Write a protein that binds this ligand. Structure first.
Ligand SMILES: O=C(O)C(O)(C(F)(F)F)C(F)(F)F
Ligand SMILES: O=C(O)C(O)(C(F)(F)F)C(F)(F)F
Ligand SMILES: O=C(O)C(O)(C(F)(F)F)C(F)(F)F
Ligand SMILES: O=C(O)C(O)(C(F)(F)F)C(F)(F)F
Ligand SMILES: [Mg+2]
Ligand SMILES: [Mg+2]
Ligand SMILES: [Mg+2]
Ligand SMILES: [Mg+2]
Lengths: 357, 357, 357, 357
């Protein structure tokens, strides 16, 4: 009944006020692929992909362009489209950039399906919109900038902030975390993210020191794929280990949770397999008793978290704000889904032209 | 926007063409609760429950009637409704009859949501309709009647049948299976169901004998809650052990799959928690690598299996045919979803009056 | 030789001085089903069921009324009656309300058997009566009322009290527990009950804080069915995790203990399967080295704990005191079994009429 | 001392004598990226990548081209280069196409290092050249063509062949294997490949049937990422389950071997991470006691298997024969490494122009 009739992609390198410094490199500009999925119903699904590094940006766009051939003239049925793509890429490897591209399609197909039915995505998934608590996500900022950004976040009504750590010395990690605590006060969350930067023994040592400071969670202390190493680190901690932004599909989540890698999860809407993958991930987090937060993609994650039985936090890190209208709002630090069909992404068409690659 | 405005239930004891004989007793007629869920949009959601024994029938209706005040004025958002009911019944025990009642509400709410959007439930879930292979489900019929029924099913185009076994002697089980096999030939499925009738050593001995006959699966060989015992039985078999019709919620499925109880699953749309529970169950079966079939509820199960990654068989056992229009049809032994909004259940209002308890 | 000759049920909604506030809802009045089991010996067995919420009250009564057909004219042999009911409800699901109703029958049958033999139940079970230490069980009361109730309990001779926690902030849980400690002094038990209200990481954080206060146990920190989550919480604690009030049958206890969910158990005489189920549960707690307390049902639990090899505490929470004579007494905070045949329940017939539903 | 000075890639779609038919689709021609790595020493390293589907071909080339700036001016030290690339792609996800691109760089860098030292790669790795038994790799060819191809291979001196199976019926798998066996005799290897086409119960049933026929190994019976499912299949078999062609890096191999997924391994030189990844994989297979074969990449795999402690078979499947000189030869079914520095890859420059995408 409704068919996909076109796929348009636009590669952009977009401005961020504050470059995302990490222990393993700076993300100084956001390389995104913006996706428009045309349909026989006239509505156009919107989504985007994050390419992490501009090195991958043109490759990701080209891959999606070539993938168009597989989906045009197929029905707008995201679950069936996903199964078809999983089969088509069985031999190549349905992971990494291929999986990310499949997820971009999925996110745009669900946005379009929401638009077909003139209903916000959360409602199409069978849930009510609810406000979801959000933390403001910062970077490897040093004491001066971490303090400045934390005061700003608290003024904006956020109740938690995340900072990136993994400086050369533990004492530097501690100094930044302690300075943020002075800026925000005691009844306020401080999440920390190591971005895979430590080995297991260093992570045990650093994390036990951070736990004495009362941090909210310790995210990706070691190499993302090392689920057994994360379990060994978690075994030495009361604070929860958080991970999941790098799980490519719910199958990788399942493997990590099966061995007790972490006590918190935070899938990325792109890497986990879009809406279809997120819903499957939510069913796993529920059974394994794991509170589930989001990673990036704040626009769609506000909808998805509202349908997630163990919903925890929304990450506010506004990578696409320069090119997407601010229809997602924050009240008392909680993300509020807009009353728009599908996801609520409206492009800033005049702005996009400035950033095209 | 769309609110629930009322709930009506009707308790019936309905005729079946053949009484369902099992090793642990006979289900001679079908005790059902038929559910109507009124909404502020003018559409009415329909579902029903199976009470198994008339002894539970009036209790189940009374419970639903007393739950009306919990759901009236709530939004028609089945995922959010399910979370609310789980919380309200946290103390009483969200299992057994209470969980079955919540599932009947869920199935009616999803039917209504499909009607609000003028779309079949399968499409609302994001999948394409597809025909699903069905097996014709029979009973503890003895050699003559089992064989007759199998021939009739083969003539109607079914490619498998299920018979119930657990006669006093193993030789009687084998005589039935052999007689069916002679009548239907080697290219035909024969599933067998023990209906929890054997202890573990008996199940190992009977199952290894049936395996030498060539059966398709061996269903519920022992007490349904004994997941470890099912695992011990499965450990002695090449043929797959099938179970799941008695799982109350996806949490019970998760416990059974976690310990290797079975190599096939067949959740019951009511006991698993309606559409909401089924979708969660489907995520679990995908990750555990378990082909997933249905139990009863053929009308909604045709939709649900179309959205299930590891969909296997639909059970054809038409409990409600006396009171529901035959909009679900079978072509070449495959169930075909009707082109109707929601589930496609239409009451036979003239017939329901005959069977009221 | 002795046959069951009648079953009478009465649904009542009975007054409690102090409504049972919990983190997940208030139990403001006690919905009970009162059971009279007539016999061919003339004696009448007495028991009752707790329905938790008035939503379930009429359904539970109706279920028991319909179950009467299965037990009238059967011998007064509770172990054989239980096996018969387990078989009769094999297909429907011998759990939830069905199991609770079966347990009400069992508790009344044993009371009647005690009366046939003119002997208190504890003696029929082969044990001597002994006083059993009891704690006074309170609710989510806030600082003022928790202090008031704790002073009263200490004046009455109880040596321990339980309070319900799970306020929005950990600091609120701590304030109440600390205030109770000022009211009762240092050589006095303070149990705490979270009523399933936390996720696993929150339970680890809160429980480690409470353990620094010296609480006696931490009860049901997370969803009752999540035995693996309880084990993960227990793994992070020196204080024992307590659970079991929600186990429906000894089979659910077995599953929880097999995976190390808890270091203490507290079966509910109704949910565990009555006297027959309690005795089986006691044999399991003995082998798994788990001290075993009771949940509610103080009248019969005084007998059952006296026959329990690992008996620990009796919960004093007098749900049925408005309708049962106070033949159970307390001396120095220990429950003292009355010298009456069977359980010692004598109805307050004049009072029951005030509360009938 | 020796630096990388440039990178050139060429994307081709090349003819194969026989299209590779599999149960999950056909690879009709070979999409390849041919890589030239220039150095300050004047030598040029050569390698290539297989893109599986033309849909990934332009994306893979674009990614390599964009990676040029990362590796130009870096020393020609493949182990250090690999560590650098792992770190640079830590966030994007060092797997899938990105990891394949890094492996193509690695293979070209090692070829160049062999040329810098005027020595075949096998000798640079510290091993002697030795002939390695090879099997001739065929496809889902049907009875007539499978049997013809097997006879031709036997005539050329190969002592084993691999056929792809997973026809719609098990009897069709068996008919193919039996026909080959009749034509080649009892002293000959017949490997079979299911190309991920079966669910676990289907794989158990089909595999136990093939085992009774006498096959050499059963390759990828189910979804490649499902290591637990492969273990369940292997647990039901005497014949070895073979897998590994889809492991992206030795970390995936380590996960699969840790849970007993298979009794044989066959890493793909590209997906495992080039020479650097292969050498790591070889260390793992030695410790886990797993005989290790190759997948594709016959030119470099002849060198690598000569340095592999548990070397088993080389797969002869000549994907690049249209564009690479036939310096690798076969004598008595054994691959013979050419006496040339590095890998021995020489481009057919006149032929490459025909096939450019
Ligand atoms: O079957 C295999 O091994 C293949 O990788 C395929 F692509 F078909 F999956 C190949 F290339 F060798 F044919
Ligand atoms: O908390 C408990 O134990 C209860 O059963 C409850 F219902 F509240 F859960 C009660 F009420 F009896 F105290
Ligand atoms: O056998 C089964 O599946 C049944 O649930 C039974 F009730 F008999 F247990 C039914 F209804 F399908 F017949
Ligand atoms: O840290 C993260 O989550 C990121 O994905 C990164 F790329 F940095 F890894 C970012 F940038 F978006 F913040
Ligand atoms: Mg992060
Ligand atoms: Mg059955
Ligand atoms: Mg309690
Ligand atoms: Mg292969």
């Amino acid at each position: 009944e409704v068919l996909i009739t076109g796929l348009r992609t636009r590669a952009v390198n977009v401005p961020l006020a504050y470059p995302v410094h990490t222990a393993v490199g700076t993300v100084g500009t956001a390389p995104l692929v913006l996706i428009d999925l045309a349909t026989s119903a006239g509505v156009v699904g919107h989504s985007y992909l994050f390419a992490y590094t501009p090195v991958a940006l043109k490759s990701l766009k080209q891959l999606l362009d070539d993938m168009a051939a597989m989906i045009v003239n197929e029905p707008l049925a995201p679950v069936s489209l996903e199964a078809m793509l999983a089969k088509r890429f069985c031999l190549a490897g349905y992971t990494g950039l291929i999986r990310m591209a499949a997820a971009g399609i999925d996110m745009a197909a669900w946005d379009a399906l929401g638009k077909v039915h003139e209903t916000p995505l959360v409602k199409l998934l069978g849930a009510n919109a609810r406000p979801v608590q959000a933390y403001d996500s910062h970077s490897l900022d040093g004491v001066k900038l971490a303090t400045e950004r934390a005061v700003t976040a608290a003024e904006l009504g956020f109740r938690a902030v995340k900072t990136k750590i993994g400086y050369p010395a533990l004492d530097q990690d501690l100094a930044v975390v302690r300075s943020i605590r002075q800026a925000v006060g005691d009844d306020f969350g401080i999440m920390v993210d190591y971005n895979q930067s430590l080995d297991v023994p260093a992570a045990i040592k650093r994390s036990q020191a951070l736990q004495q400071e009362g941090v909210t969670w310790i995210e990706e202390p070691t190499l993302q794929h090392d689920y057994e190493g994360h379990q060994r680190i978690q075994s030495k901690l009361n604070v929860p280990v958080q991970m999941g932004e790098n799980w490519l599909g719910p199958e990788e989540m399942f493997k990590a949770l099966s061995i007790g890698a972490c006590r918190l999860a935070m899938p990325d809407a792109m890497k986990i397999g879009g809406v279809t993958g997120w819903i499957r991930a939510s069913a796993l987090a529920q059974q394994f008793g794991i509170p589930m937060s989001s990673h990036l993609f704040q626009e769609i994650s506000a909808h998805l978290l509202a349908a997630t039985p163990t919903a925890h936090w929304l990450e506010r890190l506004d990578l696409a704000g320069s090119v997407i209208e601010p229809t997602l709002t924050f009240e008392g630090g909680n993300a509020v889904i807009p009353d728009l069909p599908g996801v609520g992404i409206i492009w800033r068409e005049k702005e996009i032209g400035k950033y095209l690659v």
